[PDB]
Amino acid sequence: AAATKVSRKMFRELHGVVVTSGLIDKTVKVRVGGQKFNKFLQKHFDDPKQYLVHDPNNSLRAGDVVAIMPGFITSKSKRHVVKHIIAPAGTPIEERPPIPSLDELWDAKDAAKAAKKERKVLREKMQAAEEAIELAERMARHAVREIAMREKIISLQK
Amino acid sequence: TYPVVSFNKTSSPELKEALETLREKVILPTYLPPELRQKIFNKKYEKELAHDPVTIQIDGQPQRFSYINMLTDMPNTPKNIRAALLSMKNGGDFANLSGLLEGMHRANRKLPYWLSAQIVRKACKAGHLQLILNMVRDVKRTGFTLERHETVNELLFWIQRFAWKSDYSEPETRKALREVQEILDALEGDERHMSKDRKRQQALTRFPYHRDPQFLAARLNLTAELAARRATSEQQLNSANDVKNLVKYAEQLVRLWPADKALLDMYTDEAYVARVDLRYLIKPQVHLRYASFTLQALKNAAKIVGQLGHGPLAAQLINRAAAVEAESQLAYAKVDDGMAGQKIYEMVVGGKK
Amino acid sequence: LPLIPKPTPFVPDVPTFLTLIGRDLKQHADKFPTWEALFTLTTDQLRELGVEPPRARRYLLRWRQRFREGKFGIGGDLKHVENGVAYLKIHEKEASPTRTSRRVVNVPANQHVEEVSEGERVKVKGYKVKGVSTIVGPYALPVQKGVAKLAVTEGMWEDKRGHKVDGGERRRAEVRFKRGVAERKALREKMGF
Amino acid sequence: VLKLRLARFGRTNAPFYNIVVAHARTARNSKPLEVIGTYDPVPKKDTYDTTGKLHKDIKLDVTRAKYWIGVGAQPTDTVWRLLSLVGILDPKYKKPQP
Amino acid sequence: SAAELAGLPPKSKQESWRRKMAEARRQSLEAGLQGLWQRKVKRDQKQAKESK
RNA sequence: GAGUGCGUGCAAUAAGUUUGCUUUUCUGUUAUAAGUAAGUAGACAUAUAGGUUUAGAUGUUAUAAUAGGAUCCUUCGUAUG
RNA sequence: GUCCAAAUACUUGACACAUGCUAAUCGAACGUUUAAUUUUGGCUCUUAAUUAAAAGUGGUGUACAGGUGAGUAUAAUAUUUUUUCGCUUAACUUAAAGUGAAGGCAAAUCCUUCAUAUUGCAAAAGGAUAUCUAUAUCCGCUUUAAGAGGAUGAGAAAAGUUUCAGAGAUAGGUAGUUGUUAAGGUCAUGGCUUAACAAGCCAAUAAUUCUCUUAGUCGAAGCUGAAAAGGCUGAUCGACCACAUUGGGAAUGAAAAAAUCC
Ligand SMILES: [K+]
Ligand SMILES: [K+]
Numbered sequence A: 001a002a003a004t005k006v007s008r009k010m011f012r013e014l015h016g017v018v019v020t021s022g023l024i025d026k027t028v029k030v031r032v033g034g035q036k037f038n039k040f041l042q043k044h045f046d047d048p049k050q051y052l053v054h055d056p057n058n059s060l061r062a063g064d065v066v067a068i069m070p071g072f073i074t075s076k077s078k079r080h081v082v083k084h085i086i087a088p089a090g091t092p093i094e095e096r097p098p099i100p101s102l103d104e105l106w107d108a109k110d111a112a113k114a115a116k117k118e119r120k121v122l123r124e125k126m127q128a129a130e131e132a133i134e135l136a137e138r139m140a141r142h143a144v145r146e147i148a149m150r151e152k153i154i155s156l157q158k
Numbered sequence B: 001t002y003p004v005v006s007f008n009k010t011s012s013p014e015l016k017e018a019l020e021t022l023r024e025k026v027i028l029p030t031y032l033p034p035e036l037r038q039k040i041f042n043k044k045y046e047k048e049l050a051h052d053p054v055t056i057q058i059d060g061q062p063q064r065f066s067y068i069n070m071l072t073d074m075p076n077t078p079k080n081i082r083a084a085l086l087s088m089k090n091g092g093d094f095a096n097l098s099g100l101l102e103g104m105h106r107a108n109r110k111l112p113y114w115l116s117a118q119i120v121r122k123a124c125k126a127g128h129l130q131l132i133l134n135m136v137r138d139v140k141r142t143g144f145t146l147e148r149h150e151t152v153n154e155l156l157f158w159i160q161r162f163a164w165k166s167d168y169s170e171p172e173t174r175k176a177l178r179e180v181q182e183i184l185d186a187l188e189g190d191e192r193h194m195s196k197d198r199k200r201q202q203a204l205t206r207f208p209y210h211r212d213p214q215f216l217a218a219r220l221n222l223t224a225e226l227a228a229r230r231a232t233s234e235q236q237l238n239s240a241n242d243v244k245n246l247v248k249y250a251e252q253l254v255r256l257w258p259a260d261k262a263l264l265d266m267y268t269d270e271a272y273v274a275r276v277d278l279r280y281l282i283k284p285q286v287h288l289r290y291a292s293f294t295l296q297a298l299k300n301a302a303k304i305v306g307q308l309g310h311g312p313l314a315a316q317l318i319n320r321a322a323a324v325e326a327e328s329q330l331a332y333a334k335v336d337d338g339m340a341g342q343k344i345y346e347m348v349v350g351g352k353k
Numbered sequence C: 001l002p003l004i005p006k007p008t009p010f011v012p013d014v015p016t017f018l019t020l021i022g023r024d025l026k027q028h029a030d031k032f033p034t035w036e037a038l039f040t041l042t043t044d045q046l047r048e049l050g051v052e053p054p055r056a057r058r059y060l061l062r063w064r065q066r067f068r069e070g071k072f073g074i075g076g077d078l079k080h081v082e083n084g085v086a087y088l089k090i091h092e093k094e095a096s097p098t099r100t101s102r103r104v105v106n107v108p109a110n111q112h113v114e115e116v117s118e119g120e121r122v123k124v125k126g127y128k129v130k131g132v133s134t135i136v137g138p139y140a141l142p143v144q145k146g147v148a149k150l151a152v153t154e155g156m157w158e159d160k161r162g163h164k165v166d167g168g169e170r171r172r173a174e175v176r177f178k179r180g181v182a183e184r185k186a187l188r189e190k191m192g193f
Numbered sequence D: 001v002l003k004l005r006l007a008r009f010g011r012t013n014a015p016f017y018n019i020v021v022a023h024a025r026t027a028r029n030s031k032p033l034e035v036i037g038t039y040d041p042v043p044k045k046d047t048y049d050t051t052g053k054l055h056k057d058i059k060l061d062v063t064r065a066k067y068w069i070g071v072g073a074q075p076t077d078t079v080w081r082l083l084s085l086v087g088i089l090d091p092k093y094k095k096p097q098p
Numbered sequence E: 001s002a003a004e005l006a007g008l009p010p011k012s013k014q015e016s017w018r019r020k021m022a023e024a025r026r027q028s029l030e031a032g033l034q035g036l037w038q039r040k041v042k043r044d045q046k047q048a049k050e051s052k
Numbered sequence F: 001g002a003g004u005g006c007g008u009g010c011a012a013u014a015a016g017u018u019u020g021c022u023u024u025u026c027u028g029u030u031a032u033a034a035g036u037a038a039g040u041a042g043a044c045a046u047a048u049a050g051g052u053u054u055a056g057a058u059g060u061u062a063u064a065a066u067a068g069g070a071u072c073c074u075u076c077g078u079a080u081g
Numbered sequence G: 001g002u003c004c005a006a007a008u009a010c011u012u013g014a015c016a017c018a019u020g021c022u023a024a025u026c027g028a029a030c031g032u033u034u035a036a037u038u039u040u041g042g043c044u045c046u047u048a049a050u051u052a053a054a055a056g057u058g059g060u061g062u063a064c065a066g067g068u069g070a071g072u073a074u075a076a077u078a079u080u081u082u083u084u085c086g087c088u089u090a091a092c093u094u095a096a097a098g099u100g101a102a103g104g105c106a107a108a109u110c111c112u113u114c115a116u117a118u119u120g121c122a123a124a125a126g127g128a129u130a131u132c133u134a135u136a137u138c139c140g141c142u143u144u145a146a147g148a149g150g151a152u153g154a155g156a157a158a159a160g161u162u163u164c165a166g167a168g169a170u171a172g173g174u175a176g177u178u179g180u181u182a183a184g185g186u187c188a189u190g191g192c193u194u195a196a197c198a199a200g201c202c203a204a205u206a207a208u209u210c211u212c213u214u215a216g217u218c219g220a221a222g223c224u225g226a227a228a229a230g231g232c233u234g235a236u237c238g239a240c241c242a243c244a245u246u247g248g249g250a251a252u253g254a255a256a257a258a259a260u261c262c
């Protein structure tokens, strides 16, 4: 009820080639294919694009063919994830850390997000409880004075 | 709007000292702009005000304002107003109340609830009823509100006493009757006299100040002393016109005033409890004070009303007088000898004089 | 169809009507020979007589239709009017033993309020009793304690046209600036002589 | 403040109005949110009719007009009258009988 | 209004007007939405039919 | 030789303005201090009276801490050279 | 060169301007004054009022309408389509609840503060008109839940679109800048924010920056061609941008969106 689940939607799959790797942790530059239409010449031009794909377990090396999927937003400039390796480079696929399935990656977001809310409800209650105690002490010092000053008057009427 | 408060008529040296004190520190600062008033009382600007003290263009020669220690320099207003009040012994002295009470109204000094009743007693016993009726008229300036049930009962007493002082002569009785109505008109219409204190006292009596049997009996007294003299026709037009009011006010007082209820039983028993609300009536010295003319009125009214052929009113009014006379007699024995109450009642009701 | 409403005691003739609604309409009082001519003539017939400008003619046609509907202005429901001057008085009642009700009633100047009966004791709308002996209401000049009168003043019913204070909200700082220059030039001039 | 008002179009001495849904504080002839209908003040006469009667042709989308009135649209004095004749609102002015 | 659901008559001349205007906007909103909903259902039905 | 509504460097700079090992100041609560000025409470007594007297529960005044907002200085900054 | 209707009418010096007008309105927000009118008091002066005009204080509106094309050279947190959303204390619709106490100015529905408002923080303002032989209405104010509207949050994600003036020069640009871990923030997402590490990210044919010349932009809106994603114009029409003598700036406000203000 209070937890927000990720979309968990499957987008298209693109086949590309890793251009760079090992420069930044859990990130590689993949080059996919594209094509743009020139309305003036009525001609299609090749429009190759290079994105920053999310390699969770650092299982990609420059030169391997991979299949990526968009919609997986991990950072400001990272909107793509690695789905699987089409053709490895250097070493076989069995000698690299496994690529987590999209379900495992999504579960990490839900688990991490759900845990984040559990910390807030505790921090909010403790913050509200630790403050109500101080506000409850002002009543004490203010109540003893009234009870000490109001009973005095009442003690001279009976 | 109004001229700056100033006192330039003091018969005694002590009176001037009490007014000059309040005037130069409690009244005058009320004429300065708000920012300058705060500066006067600030310790940080003490040295600055010494070199170049604030000034005021007051009818010529200017005043000066140095630093005023709010705790030590400021004088006790209730005490000074007392010293000035007691010292007042000449008409020129009492004329300062118009400026004094105006200054406190500007300073927002919540004066003692009973103070008004005191000014009306000391000023009227000296023969200055007009100064009171003049301030009671100019309440927008002086702040002489008729909020207390004692002030109204005290003011109406001296009004009648002045008429009775000269055997209830027609020239003065017409003037007194004019004043009693000018007050009952203010209590009803004028809003300056309505405050939280009044609403509380009107709730304890269940009779507004303008429909209180104790006060309506004052008007009925003078009206009863006008038909008595006559009951040339240019004067008879008034006599025949006064008989209509007498029978009118009489039947109005009998309706409000319950049956066989004296002055101490008229209002709710819970009214005489609080000392700030209608407790003065308990003391026999003060009861006979406000029960002298109120009793004589019913007696004379029941007599005149009886000659015109009004059986019911004749019996009704006598019922009240019988109830007040019985209670009044109890006060004569309880009151201490030599008290003002025992004297006035002896001179009005007893007629010993 | 163009019904004519009967004249009221407060508006007996046309010269009175055109005087109340103001806007300099008392100039064309002679154009209307009778009281029916006012409520019978049309726009075209009011234009040939010389009822100009168009604002005054349209303003008259409005108050003309406003009179048929009994939507009079102030003091339009009076009955005891004498030569264009009415008198107001207070009628005190007894709503309760501790209260009084005061209503501003219109009676002849001589008769007393208590003497008048309910039928002829009219209660004027728009005037109220302040205090105990004050008659508050537009165009209520006091004569005695609890007595006032309504003199038929020009423009008593008129809808005042708005006016510009000192040349409007746009040309205000300029008009006052130029007045000061003219004022200063005439104080300095007298100094020369 | 949405309003159902008229936008004057046409030529000199040939008025033709357009019922529109526009914000109060906008130009009279600016492009509104919608065009509910049209209004022609000059009454016409049937072609082959000699009775002398006259009619005023008005095109109005009653369905669209009702929705805007239900959300708080304020029709002007002229459009209020038209809507009253159709039966959507109550007349604002009536001929005094007395 | 609570006073209307309780079957109470209008208090003043102005209350009667507010009651009529408020009800006019209620019936207009109902007939408006429904009347416009059928247009949508009728429009997209013609599109899907012609396109199919 | 004449002109410049152009760009730019330094100096200077009104309104305005970043920052703080600045300078005053107001307000807000928090904890105290006072009860003389005010204001709010209680006790006793007086009588053509309304006086004496103690008290801080709201509130007033003062200090301290603390939060925040305006001033001064600082930095930047049209004109101008 | 006879008559009539409609439609257009400073394309140049955003050159300088005589004169009258384009934003005012509410007395059912508020008192100040001046006049008469009526009341006091003391014997013309002096109190308390009523009334009418004239200046104002306040509330709302000048953020709309109308005018102009000087400046301005663009790819942008720009824009459509689908999915998912968020905010909105003014005004417009529906309803509910609350509308009490002081001080300052001459007074106030103006300012300052307070009590109360599911728990705990957090509001308000009064005015006016009838009835009776105090009661109930009317116009407001504050708060709250919704609808509509909106110039709304950098909304987000996926897939797309935008003919970017002409000439010359410049190879670096980016420093929360790019990514990871952890935490906060957010409806959600994003260095959005911070700590600690890593040295990345965009670009290489000009990304980026600089100088000069010229220009308001667009639309079957106008003109034109048989036609081209045609060409030209950017008057009247509608949308957008900028400006109000030139330059340099801020606040108020729901929102600058002013011919305002400094
Ligand atoms: K410099
Ligand atoms: K331009």
Ligand SMILES: [Mg+2]
Pocket (backbone or CB within 6 Å): none
């Ligand atoms: Mg190819």
Ligand SMILES: [Mg+2]
Pocket (backbone or CB within 6 Å): none
């Ligand atoms: Mg410098």
Ligand SMILES: [Mg+2]
Pocket (backbone or CB within 6 Å): none
């Ligand atoms: Mg500076």
Ligand SMILES: [Mg+2]
Pocket (backbone or CB within 6 Å): F036
């Ligand atoms: Mg003291």
Ligand SMILES: [Mg+2]
Pocket (backbone or CB within 6 Å): none
């Ligand atoms: Mg220094």
Ligand SMILES: [Mg+2]
Pocket (backbone or CB within 6 Å): none
């Ligand atoms: Mg310079």
Ligand SMILES: [Mg+2]
Pocket (backbone or CB within 6 Å): G010
């Ligand atoms: Mg031009």
Ligand SMILES: [Mg+2]
Pocket (backbone or CB within 6 Å): none
């Ligand atoms: Mg504009």
Ligand SMILES: [Mg+2]
Pocket (backbone or CB within 6 Å): G126
């Ligand atoms: Mg109130």
Ligand SMILES: [Mg+2]
Pocket (backbone or CB within 6 Å): G159
């Ligand atoms: Mg798609």
Ligand SMILES: [Mg+2]
Pocket (backbone or CB within 6 Å): G176
């Ligand atoms: Mg950034």
Ligand SMILES: [Mg+2]
Pocket (backbone or CB within 6 Å): G215
């Ligand atoms: Mg140009």
Ligand SMILES: [Mg+2]
Pocket (backbone or CB within 6 Å): none
């Ligand atoms: Mg243009």
